[PDB]
Motif scaffolding. Structure first.
Motif, PDB file in Angstrom:
ATOM      1  N   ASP B 232      45.313  20.455  12.226  1.00 19.29           N
ATOM      2  CA  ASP B 232      46.182  21.144  11.277  1.00 19.29           C
ATOM      3  C   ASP B 232      46.241  22.603  11.691  1.00 19.29           C
ATOM      4  OD1 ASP B 232      47.536  22.135   8.975  1.00 19.29           O
ATOM      5  OD2 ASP B 232      45.872  21.715   7.614  1.00 19.29           O
ATOM      6  N   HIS B 296      40.844  24.500   3.285  1.00 16.37           N
ATOM      7  CA  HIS B 296      40.428  23.168   2.863  1.00 16.37           C
ATOM      8  C   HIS B 296      39.650  22.526   4.004  1.00 16.37           C
ATOM      9  CE1 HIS B 296      43.404  21.553   5.618  1.00 16.37           C
ATOM     10  NE2 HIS B 296      44.209  22.488   5.148  1.00 16.37           N
ATOM     11  N   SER B 323      39.968  24.699   7.285  1.00 22.20           N
ATOM     12  CA  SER B 323      41.061  25.572   7.697  1.00 22.20           C
ATOM     13  C   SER B 323      40.819  27.013   7.253  1.00 22.20           C
ATOM     14  CB  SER B 323      42.410  25.081   7.157  1.00 22.20           C
ATOM     15  OG  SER B 323      42.487  25.199   5.752  1.00 22.20           O
ATOM     16  N   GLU B 325      43.639  29.823   6.629  1.00 17.87           N
ATOM     17  CA  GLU B 325      45.106  29.874   6.608  1.00 17.87           C
ATOM     18  C   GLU B 325      45.639  30.799   5.524  1.00 17.87           C
ATOM     19  OE1 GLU B 325      47.100  26.270   5.291  1.00 17.87           O
ATOM     20  OE2 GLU B 325      45.148  25.243   5.162  1.00 17.87           O
ATOM     21  N   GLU B 339      47.354  29.735  10.733  1.00 16.42           N
ATOM     22  CA  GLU B 339      46.306  28.790  10.368  1.00 16.42           C
ATOM     23  C   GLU B 339      45.630  28.208  11.600  1.00 16.42           C
ATOM     24  OE1 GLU B 339      47.736  25.064   8.689  1.00 16.42           O
ATOM     25  OE2 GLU B 339      45.755  24.647   7.855  1.00 16.42           O
TER      26      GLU B 339
HETATM   27 MN   LIG Z   1      45.887  23.308   6.143  1.00 18.49          MN
END
Ligand SMILES: [Mn+2]
Ligand SMILES: [Mn+2]
Ligand SMILES: [Mn+2]
Ligand SMILES: [Mn+2]
Lengths: 362, 362
Positions: B232, B296, B323, B325, B339
């Motif tokens: 991500d 998260h 993360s 971000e 991020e």
């Molecule tokens: Mn994320």
């Protein structure tokens, strides 16, 4: 008969207090709202004799009120227990709830039980599946849109295969799915199949990074989701000139599929439709190699009712939608399938896909 | 330290007879098998003091045996009742089963109850989540592969945008996912976001078939599934020369994200990590526009633990993955998010993605 009225009639007949419908596809089917709750809670509560309630996360309430009608809509904040808010709105008395047994997880039925007590859960899914058997004009139109996308997929797929230059089965799949994504298709309805030569005879065949074989057939089985509804179609083409044997297998399958298409109309039975194609393939000498039913229902799912299979004396009726997909699969030699899904009209049927069925050379 | 031993210790502590683990991600986490049973039944049965059993559909048995050891593997044919087959194989007597409450549908718990009687179900998911919180070296290596694909996605995405010629947000999404599919990455970890200009300030923005705006920023939020693990990442670039205001917003977000990355090490708290970035953005004057938590957890899912949010005094530990971000979203003007996800090491952290964070002009 409205779908909601039909569910209320079921609740009264079975003496069940209310529904708590959770599958997003069912919610869309019954309300028109494509509500994605994720792991937040949503539920449609139909009652024996009261206004249906639609329960959603708080951030969906505004829009649900605008895009549905006839539902009493309320929500919950993330700081709240969703089941408590449900209980606070459903005032007396609940001892049985109709739910979708294959969808609703234990956390949700235990949440309901914590608020309502020792409730008897009843499966609503058999009723929903029965309701889905006959499509409205609106559903048929959405399926035509999905069918039009499937035909475009064949055009893209054939052209991609024809370029040769080491192109693989998985290359062709990716290109098809890429063009669909560019056109706003959210997902294919099932895993796209592109299978070269004898690989098309494998019932568990899957496209791989293998070059398509010259002078062999190439099977394309594909479909899209669009507007909540599925398409499903198969065509088998030739990459260069095929041999006489493979060309004759194609001809047999093609004629069997067209014969079933010309036969389907209200009043015939599912058994009889299956037999039109199966008898023709069996007469040609290849009955042993046509080893699946002629068809399955299609709608929001690629696999629903009716089953077009021997032993099913179901009478075909207007508004049914199902596949017509005979095939001959000879391991290590050749596989051919030709498939359309169709909707039954007042006096015959129409296919959702119009791509040429003949053995085209690319 | 075996994961199975840890589950057996839970069963002994809680006086629970066995597990019936059903979530395919959990099954992969504990066995290494990527078994998608679909609507067929699979279940991992760990016991208090006997050999673990793995129940699968018949056609998955051969692969289960080839790539696991120490599990007693057995299957069922589609002609059989899977719950009966399970019951006949378990010769110890069973009154409580640990299951995954958010996964297991009513049909499956009722199937178990029909064969085993009045079972007490106990939720295993809090334990699974606790185990997943700390990643092994092997898991970090798989997550590095997923991040490496995410970095390739940025290169492709930037280049597709640079081509202009009417390219749209959805065009760019489609090209990214097409190239991932060609490299054997069939699914993204979440819906790819490409958002041009003021559209990137919308917290609910989604890519559409609209042309990307010249002299505006372009936000890319993307990630893939690879080997069972997710990535991500977000980068925000400029299409042509940006204006000074948007470039300064980018600079603030970039510095806040790097400051949090430089701060993270074992012993700090989730609250403190969030505050490092949030305090910078607030001092710069944009605190009102940074309206989500800093991070998260990530692992097999893009949405796991820890939560990097104010008020979470959790002590960060080696092996946690999450993360970082921060973002600034000014409605109808500009949205910037930058991020990376990261893994905590003995004395700091390392990033899963390495694409330049600077405001690049394409
Ligand atoms: Mn994320
Ligand atoms: Mn098909
Ligand atoms: Mn089909
Ligand atoms: Mn992201």
């Amino acid at each position: 008969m409205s779908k909601i009225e039909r569910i209320s009639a079921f609740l009264n007949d079975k003496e069940v207090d209310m529904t708590f419908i959770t599958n997003p596809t069912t919610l869309n089917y019954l309300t028109g709202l494509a509500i994605d709750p994720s792991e937040r809670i949503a539920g449609l509560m139909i009652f024996r004799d009261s206004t249906p309630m639609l329960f959603t996360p708080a951030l969906e309430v505004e829009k649900a009120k605008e895009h549905t009608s006839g539902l009493d809509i309320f929500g919950y904040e993330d700081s709240q227990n969703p089941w408590e808010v449900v209980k606070n709105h459903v005032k007396s008395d609940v001892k049985s709830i109709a739910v979708e047994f294959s969808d609703i997880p234990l956390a949700k039925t235990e949440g309901l039980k914590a608020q309502f007590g020792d409730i008897n859960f009843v499966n609503l899914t058999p009723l929903i599946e029965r309701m889905r058997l006959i499509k409205s004009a609106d559903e048929i139109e959405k399926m035509k849109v999905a069918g039009d996308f499937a035909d475009k997929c064949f055009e893209i797929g054939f052209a991609t295969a024809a370029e040769r230059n080491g192109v693989t089965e998985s290359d062709i799949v990716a290109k098809i799915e890429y063009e669909m994504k560019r056109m706003g298709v959210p997902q294919m309805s099932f895993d796209t199949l592109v299978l070269s030569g004898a690989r098309a005879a494998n019932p568990h065949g899957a496209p791989e990074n293998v070059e398509i074989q010259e002078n062999k057939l190439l099977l394309f089985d594909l479909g899209v989701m669009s507007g909540g509804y599925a398409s499903d179609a198969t065509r088998t083409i030739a990459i260069g000139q095929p041999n006489d044997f493979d060309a004759e297998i194609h001809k047999i399958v093609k004629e069997a599929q067209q014969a079933a298409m010309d036969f389907i109309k209200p009043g015939v039975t599912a058994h009889e439709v299956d037999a039109v194609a199966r008898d023709l393939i069996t007469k040609a000498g290849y009955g042993e190699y046509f080893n699946h039913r002629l068809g399955h229902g299609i709608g929001m799912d690629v696999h629903e009712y009716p089953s077009i299979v021997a032993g099913n004396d179901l009478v075909i009726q207007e508004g049914m939608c199902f596949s017509n997909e005979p095939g001959i699969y000879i391991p290590g030699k050749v596989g051919v399938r030709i498939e359309d899904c169709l909707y039954v009209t007042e006096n015959g049927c129409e296919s959702f896909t119009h791509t040429d069925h003949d053995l085209l050379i690319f």
